Amino acid sequence: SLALSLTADQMVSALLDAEPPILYSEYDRPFSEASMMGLLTNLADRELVHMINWAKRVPGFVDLTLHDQVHLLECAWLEILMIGLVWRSMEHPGKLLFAPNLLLDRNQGKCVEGMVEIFDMLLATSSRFRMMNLQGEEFVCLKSIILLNSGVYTFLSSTLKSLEEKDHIHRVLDKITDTLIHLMAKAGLTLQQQHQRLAQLLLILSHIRHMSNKGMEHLYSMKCKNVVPLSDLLLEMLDAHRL
């Protein structure tokens, strides 16, 4: 209910202090593929735990059934991890700031087979964000749009209870749109400019989706190769995409 009643400034505020903290890696010296992929997945794992708590704070998100919130994180999780990574790396051209103590540059992504291509994409996105001078308040909104948008079409049930579920997610997503526009109006953007930037921002979410799909395959190919012992929760998030 109260999610829809929110003002533009209260949505921004809700989102800005639901923001999870930045986590730390672990401390070295030479990097094997095993040690490397072990540091990145240990990290992803801890970050998922905090994300589950961030999702719950995201307005309207807990209004959804257990099963639908489940499904939405199942679809959204690596994208969410990725946009946070690209966001944290804005201010560092050429490097991916996974953690304050784990800042890796392209050459270092050749330590792990297959992840250099994905590295480049993550770099490109960060560079694009930088190019647009993306703002923290647009970032938190982008990130909610992903949580709510990414699983919403893969709700296939044709029950009464499930249609108004989609419409609710569709109404929340409209507020978050209203807010993004509110942010750009504030920045003193013209109307044409506002529609152009909104457009630009959401087209980037298409690239983040592709990135997620690729990183998901990559992560499945390491699971097989028995390189990294992945956590149980990461295993079960990963197992959600061959279902």
């Binding site: 735990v49 589950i52 999702a55 257990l66 489940v70 994180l73 199942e74 149980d232 929760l233 079960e236």
Partner: peptide, 9 residues
């Protein structure tokens, strides 16, 4: 079922 559980806590 871990995700499930984590959303309840």
């Amino acid at each position: 079922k871990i995700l499930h559980r984590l959303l309840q806590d």
